[PDB]
């Protein structure tokens, strides 16, 4: 069943017990934290042998 | 409770796992802050069940 | 409700 991703993530916030307006009021910051965290996985996997 | 949806012209609150449309009210919704912050927001009247009885 | 009861 399709749902907009910004709304999918709102019901995932609602599932951890954080009121869903916390996403919509911080959506740019939350997306920047996600995009920056995926960027650091490239570096970890590119650099580290173990 | 769930999700805002529209059938083309009206707007309703509904539960996520079975379509059951309800009139949007000050009970089935909650306020937080001004309209300017939210990325994707729409203009529709929210019904307030106290006022039309109180002012009757 | 309380101050609205002044209506
Ligand atoms: C919440 O924490 C975030 C970082 O996780 C803060 O965001 C940074 O704030 C500084 C100063 O305003 C900016 O230079 C950075 O660009 C921000 N980072 C991002 C990813 O946007 C944020 O200020 C904190 N907010 C509160 C209310 O404490
Ligand atoms: C969306 O839902 C509303 C409410 O169920 C529909 O409005 C009703 O439409 C029927 C005819 O289909 C009328 O007999 C009723 O009098 C209308 N009710 C009200 C309160 O106006 C509406 O037709 C639905 N469909 C669309 C495309 O908006
Ligand atoms: C879904 O996307 C549309 C655009 O595809 C959003 O509407 C506006 O579209 C113009 C032209 O692309 C942009 O300049 C505006 O910034 C958009 N406004 C907003 C608030 O994004 C539409 O609002 C979006 N709706 C949702 C629920 O995300
Ligand atoms: C949604 O409603 C708001 C508030 O009415 C609109 O924002 C401004 O509203 C005042 C009157 O309340 C007008 O004088 C301004 O001209 C409106 N701003 C703009 C840029 O037009 C808002 O435009 C409405 N949005 C939609 C999509 O209808």
Curated annotation (Swiss-Prot), chain A:
Role of this protein: Subunit of the fusion protein that is processed upon entry into the host cell. Mediates fusion of the virion and cellular membranes by functioning as a class I viral fusion protein. Contains a viral fusion peptide that is unmasked after S2 cleavage. This cleavage can occur at the cell membrane by host TMPRSS2 or during endocytosis by host CSTL. In either case, this triggers an extensive and irreversible conformational change that leads to fusion of the viral envelope with the cellular cytoplasmic membrane, releasing viral genomic RNA into the host cell cytoplasm.
Name of protein: Spike protein S2'
Name of the encoding gene: S
Residues included from the entire protein: 894 to 943 of 1273
């Amino acid at each position: 069943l399709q749902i907009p991703f910004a709304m999918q993530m709102a019901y995932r916030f609602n599932g951890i017990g954080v009121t869903q307006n916390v996403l919509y009021e911080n959506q740019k910051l939350i997306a920047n934290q996600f995009n920056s965290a995926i960027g650091k996985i490239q570096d970890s996997l590119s650099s580290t042998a173990s | 409770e769930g999700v805002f949806v529209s059938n083309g012209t009206h707007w309703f609150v509904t539960q996520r796992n079975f379509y059951e449309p309800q009139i949007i009210t000050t009970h089935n919704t909650f306020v937080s802050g001004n309209c300017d912050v939210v990325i994707g927001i729409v203009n529709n009247t929210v019904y307030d069940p106290l006022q039309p009885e109180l002012d009757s």
